[PDB]
Amino acid sequence: PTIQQLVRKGRTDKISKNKTPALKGSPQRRGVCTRVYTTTPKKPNSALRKVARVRLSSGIEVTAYIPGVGHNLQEHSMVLVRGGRVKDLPGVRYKIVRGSLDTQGVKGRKQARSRYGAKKEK
Amino acid sequence: TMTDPIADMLTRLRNANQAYHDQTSMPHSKIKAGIAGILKSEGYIADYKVNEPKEGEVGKTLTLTLKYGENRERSIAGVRRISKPGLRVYAKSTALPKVLGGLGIAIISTSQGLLTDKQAHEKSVGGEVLAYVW
RNA sequence: AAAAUGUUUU
RNA sequence: UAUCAGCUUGUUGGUGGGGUAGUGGCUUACCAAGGCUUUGACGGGUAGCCGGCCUGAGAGGGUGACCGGCCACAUUGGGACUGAGAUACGGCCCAGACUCCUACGGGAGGCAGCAGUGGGGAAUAUUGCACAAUGGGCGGAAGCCUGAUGCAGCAACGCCGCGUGCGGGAUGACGGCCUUCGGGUUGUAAACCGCUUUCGCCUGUGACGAAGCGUGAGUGACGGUAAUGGGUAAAGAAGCACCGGCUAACUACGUGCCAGCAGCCGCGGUGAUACGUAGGGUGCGAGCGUUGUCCGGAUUUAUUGGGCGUAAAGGGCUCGUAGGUGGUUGAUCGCGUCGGAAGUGUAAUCUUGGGGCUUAACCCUGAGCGUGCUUUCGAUACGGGUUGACUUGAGGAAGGUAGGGGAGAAUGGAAUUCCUGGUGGAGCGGUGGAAUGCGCAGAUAUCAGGAGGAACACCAGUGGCGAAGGCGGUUCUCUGGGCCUUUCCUGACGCUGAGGAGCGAAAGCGUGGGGAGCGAACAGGCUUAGAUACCCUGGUAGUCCACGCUGUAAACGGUGGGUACUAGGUGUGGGGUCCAUUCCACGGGUUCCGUGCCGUAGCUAACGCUUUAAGUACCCCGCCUGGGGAGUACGGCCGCAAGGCUAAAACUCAAAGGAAUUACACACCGCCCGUCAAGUCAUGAAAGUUGGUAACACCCGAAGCCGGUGGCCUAACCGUUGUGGGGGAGCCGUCGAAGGUGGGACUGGUGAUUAGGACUAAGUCGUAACAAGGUAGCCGUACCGGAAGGUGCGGCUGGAUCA
């Protein structure tokens, strides 16, 4: 565009889409497990991915993935929910922080323990 | 209609130099004559001449004769217009532009007449950055 | 001269 | 932010008065009718601003913690009082909401001071010490006060520094792990030998900050602190992430599309370097990862620094308003611009030079920076202002001139159809083949006569004209623009143009007319698994006319307008002018303006473009920012309607796409479209229903200031010493928070029902597109149909046959 066109109407940037609206500017949010279940992944891929409908303290209810082999949380279990997308799962944009609040660390972890909330074993 | 006769001079020179023409001609103006003079003094054209009208009998004609070196080699690596009519560019005595790392010359119209950057910097005078001929 | 279609391997 | 276009009536100005520290509609009376606004007023949304901070090559982008400056506020709303000074945080008055005391009559209170509690939250500390230092208040002073401040506690929250050992040690030991059973690896690692003592722990010494303060005596909260001597033992002191690619670092075992991993590409279906564990390794290290957020990479909003023929992108076209922009030149101004000077840009930060903490972080100090602004003095090349010339841009005159440019009216012939008559007799028509249909009630055919509507063979394309859409019988009338020309005239009058206005194929709509042919819909016949199609026979709107409306097209050259420059070659349309023979014209040239093809430089991803640019440049406008959702919803405008214009978001995918090579590449047993059925997610409509915010018009109206009044109460003043002056309570009036009442505006949730979108069975129904996709496809519009789609009308080539 001409300089006069830029003067009359300047450049405008893009919108910069948000990824995790339910957190509302917080690194993680507390919630209650309104439902605990399993979902089939999209294709390709095939499994029984463990997820939970959680009512976060922001008043929004979202689906959160439960990582790691092992699971204890059930109905009305208080959880901490952080960001994180599961690519082969449409509509899952959050994960549950293992080792925090009611959810507990994966039992037999010995590598990458901190990411699954597993205390070091003597 | 014609908007920037200086840009017309620059593009005429660029096109003629690219097409390997020995001479180019245009309607004459004082600033065009000054730019041609400093181009000749800096060695980018062989010579220049202002001709009294005898074909159109209307106005003076400025004619630039260019120089090509051994094996038909361009003496002008390019010319660019800086202070456009749509957006004019003025440079201070400290912020004078450098062309081709200093190899080329920026033509600056200062309050003391047309002066190449090197000159201006020596006189510590700025002005309107007309061209970047290199 | 008209004359349709071709699931999910691993 | 325009999906907010009108706002304001003390409002804008004037005069007099009042008021105030002070100017002022600050207030008041009177007069006038202003003021603001598409260069965005008013309204909505969000927000304290800045020095700075983060990021970045820079330009920028994000941000406003500590520290420092300004502002605002102190339970919410309002008000004044006192004072030099008041949003009066730890004041007062009134009202509201709260909490507390009460003997029920009435009272008391405001941590967004410091610490602290509850609560909310992913998340942020002690109900500490001292006024020793600096700062502040009062006092003549000693001094008193200071949750300012100086300190300490707490937390890896950040930055910085240090330690967890150092040297030697092959016999390359065991043990793990791997193996080709040879060995390899962990690994100089260990064992073993000799050393050192920072930190920690134990113990001793022990400050500076005080050139303070105090008449003196005396006087350090931090504090037995820092620092430092001695002692102990190599000890009390290493984890976290990662190892398919980007990306530094690989193997074994277990698992078997399971369990799981992932930032993207993807991994897992029995040989997993991608899951889990182990050995080994790598990056970091008192940290290491994850999440959130910001900048970078992203030139992915491109001023620096991008684009629009086919990838997303040129408005359908023109006129034209604001605006942007401006041929040659004289003079002048000195606003832009440029150069000095002065002032300012506090400090801190930041850059940098010195200095101090054992180094560093950090701290002090000098300078720079502070990218500007104001004042002032210069310069005049350029931009602009003022002013005067010039003619080459532009327009005009005169003459020459081409044409389907437009509008109106009359009118010509052929052909179709119908009608009348003659003749004549069995079919005609139609197709791939047929049938429906028409025909002995005489069709088809054939001749004559007539009626009527519509379109204009040949000329006619390789062409002309128009801003585009578009424009073809002839004649006349009216009218627009273009081209050329040497003289002539004006003298930059130019270009472009947001908003706005007009024009704008076809279809469509309204009123009236007309209706031959054609022909959506429709009916029938065929084909077919079906055939709501192709094909056939019929056939209504429409096609036509008049006047309006609509305002969209593949409205395409998918290429905005103007200008200058940059090889040629070769057709063709228009105007001149020149030449020879003519004294026509044939011919050649040449010039100006069109319109094609080839083609150089150049450009482009390629295809291709190339003087008619998609090349080199300058001016102005429109437009693009991944694909869907979607040119859809909501709102608004326009319309009689159809609809058009303006124009999102949630959600979803990791592609979509351009050209080309050999819409398919799993390679036609390909690909691929839409209903219907099922599930999931987000969203729209909806009788309604439920909130919220911002105001408005009235009614009432506390405190309070102001203006009145004051019969009541009054020590200073004066008295003719009976009082008066002046004041005060009280009372009234204006304004006035709150409340009440009413009607609107905006907006959130929800809503039976309903609509479409996205994704998922590997469901059902057809095959619409991609090849001539088997009826070339697509664009606008119209009607029809289970659904794709079918058909009519006009258009396009992003189709082709035959040349």
Ligand SMILES: [Mg+2]
């Ligand atoms: Mg007055």
Ligand SMILES: [Mg+2]
């Ligand atoms: Mg705020």
Ligand SMILES: [Mg+2]
């Ligand atoms: Mg800001």
Ligand SMILES: [Mg+2]
């Ligand atoms: Mg502050």
Ligand SMILES: [Mg+2]
């Ligand atoms: Mg006072």
Ligand SMILES: [Mg+2]
């Ligand atoms: Mg106070």
Ligand SMILES: [Mg+2]
């Ligand atoms: Mg105060």
Ligand SMILES: [Mg+2]
């Ligand atoms: Mg208080």
Ligand SMILES: [Mg+2]
């Ligand atoms: Mg507090």
Ligand SMILES: [Mg+2]
């Ligand atoms: Mg809490």
Ligand SMILES: [Mg+2]
């Ligand atoms: Mg003191």
Ligand SMILES: [Mg+2]
């Ligand atoms: Mg004293």
Ligand SMILES: [Mg+2]
């Ligand atoms: Mg006290």
Ligand SMILES: [Mg+2]
């Ligand atoms: Mg590598």
Ligand SMILES: [Mg+2]
């Ligand atoms: Mg295995």
Ligand SMILES: [Mg+2]
């Ligand atoms: Mg950028």
